[PDB]
Amino acid sequence: STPFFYPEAIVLAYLYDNEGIATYDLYKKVNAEFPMSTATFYDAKKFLIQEGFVKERQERGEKRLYLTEKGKLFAISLKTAIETYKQIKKRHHH
Amino acid sequence: KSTPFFYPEAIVLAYLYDNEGIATYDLYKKVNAEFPMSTATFYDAKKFLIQEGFVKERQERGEKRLYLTEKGKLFAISLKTAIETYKQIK
């Protein structure tokens, strides 16, 4: 489900500008716009950590997400794509 | 299936920008060079892009020709940016 982006792409895009977010809150946010399961969401967190786009730290009584140098770069161009997608969907509910 | 961030539709659509008027078969080959995928997968993606209105098929010049709708034109640009950025990061 959801064309054209996999979960790793959405999760990555959403993290941009939300560094510091507790992991599960990032899930709530993503899910509010692009519904996915926690299984699918965590699979994506796993992957982006493993491929060196995202870092997860236990800070201030929570596990939180930061972007990586290569994540920060990629996240921006993904955001622009998903965002344009969202606006294309809105434009065209006809 | 294969590639991480992008579903075949996304790759297909990005690659069609502006190889507009490419023969379908030839778009397959181009796509397959950087993003190996089966024809089954490719044609699935062609089907979807036409049915959700990003792409149109017309027979021109004795060939199956793929073109971008207006919706597809806006979207392909932003997609190609992301894929390009991805390739440069790999």
CB A71 within 8 A of CB B5: no
For the record, the structure tokens of A72 come out as 């920060």
CB A22 within 8 A of CB A62: yes
Distance from CA of A38 to the nearest CA of B (A): 18
Torsion of Cα atoms, B24 then B28 then B34 then B38, to 10°: 150
Distance from CA of B62 to the nearest CA of A (A): 31
For the record, the structure tokens of A53 come out as 């786009």
Q: How far apart are CA A75 and CA B2, in angstroms?
A: 20
Q: How far apart are CA A24 and CA A78, in angstroms?
A: 21
Residue A56 three-state SS: strand
Cβ-count burial of A18 within 10 angstroms (0-12 exposed, 13-18 middle, 19+ buried)?
middle
Q: How far apart are CA A82 and CA A85, in angstroms?
A: 5
CB contact under 8 A, B7 and A3: yes
Q: Which domain holds residue B4?
A: 1-90
Domain count, chain B: 1
* B67 strand-pairing partners: B56
Q: Technique behind this structure?
A: X-ray
Q: What is the Cα A14 distance to its own chain's centre? A: 4
Which CATH number do you get for residue A68? 1.10.10.10
